[PDB]
Amino acid sequence: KTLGEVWKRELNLLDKRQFELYKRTDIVEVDRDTARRHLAEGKVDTGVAVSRGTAKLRWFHERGYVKLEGRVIDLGCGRGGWCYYAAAQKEVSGVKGFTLGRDGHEKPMNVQSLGWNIITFKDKTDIHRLEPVKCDTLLCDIGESSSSSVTEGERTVRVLDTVEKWLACGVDNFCVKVLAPYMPDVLEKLELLQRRFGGTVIRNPLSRNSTHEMYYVSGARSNVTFTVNQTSRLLMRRMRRPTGKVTLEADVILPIGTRSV
Numbered sequence: 001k002t003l004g005e006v007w008k009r010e011l012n013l014l015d016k017r018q019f020e021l022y023k024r025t026d027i028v029e030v031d032r033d034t035a036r037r038h039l040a041e042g043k044v045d046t047g048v049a050v051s052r053g054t055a056k057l058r059w060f061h062e063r064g065y066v067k068l069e070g071r072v073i074d075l076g077c078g079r080g081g082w083c084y085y086a087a088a089q090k091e092v093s094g095v096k097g098f099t100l101g102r103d104g105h106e107k108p109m110n111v112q113s114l115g116w117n118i119i120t121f122k123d124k125t126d127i128h129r130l131e132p133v134k135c136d137t138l139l140c141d142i143g144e145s146s147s148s149s150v151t152e153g154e155r156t157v158r159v160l161d162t163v164e165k166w167l168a169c170g171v172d173n174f175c176v177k178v179l180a181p182y183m184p185d186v187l188e189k190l191e192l193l194q195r196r197f198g199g200t201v202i203r204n205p206l207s208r209n210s211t212h213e214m215y216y217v218s219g220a221r222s223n224v225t226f227t228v229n230q231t232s233r234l235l236m237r238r239m240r241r242p243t244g245k246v247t248l249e250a251d252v253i254l255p256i257g258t259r260s261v
């Protein structure tokens with residue numbers, strides 16, 4: 001019954017053509033051409049991002065939605081876009097990335113952008129069964145889309161359930177993907193987490209319209225229900241006018257080399 005649940009229903013009614021167009025309507029996208037060429041060539045010293053994720057985290061970081069400091073842990077690191085971005089920040093002292101990296105799941109990519117030497121990647125790891133570790137900055141970018149809102153809700157609550165174990169260890173900063181913030185059980189869990197750990201959910205402009213994902217971050221505090229519905233309204237306006245118009249932006253280029261001394 002929430003606006004988001006209606007959005008899901010309408011989204012499933014779209015055909016292949018409509019979906020493609022709607023998905024990119026009025027969104028921002030980084031140009032990945034150069035990065036893809038460099039990675040295909042096996043270049044590791046050009047500072048290009050291993051995934052579109054680097055730009056996503058940069059957006060939150062550059063405007064204070066999440067501070068990247070001290071010991072960073074990245075749950076569901078995949079290729080490592082967030083790990084490399086974090087590793088390049090002077091305030092960060094170490095980065096530990098964990099991901100499944102198997103049976104189709106993306107494995108950590110090895111490049112040598114600034115601070116690559118302070119990153120420890122660990123694949124073949126299900127973060128839902130990983131014993132929480134003390135850290136200062138907790139990142140998690142997990143959440144698989146589903147045509148079923150019930151399923152997206154289940155997946156989102158599971159992620160929040162696991163993340164709560166890590167936040168309970170005491171963390172200063174966090175940025176966690178919330179796949180389906182529009183589901184009522186999720187809204188309630190977010191309200192409870194907000195009272196316990198602070199923060200709020202923010203929509204990243206680089207997210208495609210095909211997902212209602214928002215990120216639970218430590219750098220701001222606001223009315224969760226209100227802001228989730230603001231995004232539901234935006235997503236629905238875009239479905240009524242699916243122009244497929246995209247705004248291209250320059251991708252992230254990080255410094256290179258090891259952080260030493």
Ligand SMILES: Nc1ncnc2c1ncn2[C@@H]1O[C@H](CSCC[C@H](N)C(=O)O)[C@@H](O)[C@H]1O
Nearest residue numbers: 051053076078081082099100105126127141
């Ligand atoms: N239970 C789990 N444990 C560990 N990793 C998981 C997981 N479920 C999903 N994942 C992984 O989480 C990743 C989400 S995509 C993460 C992209 C990353 N932020 C970047 O910037 O590149 C995927 O690789 C997915 O395979």
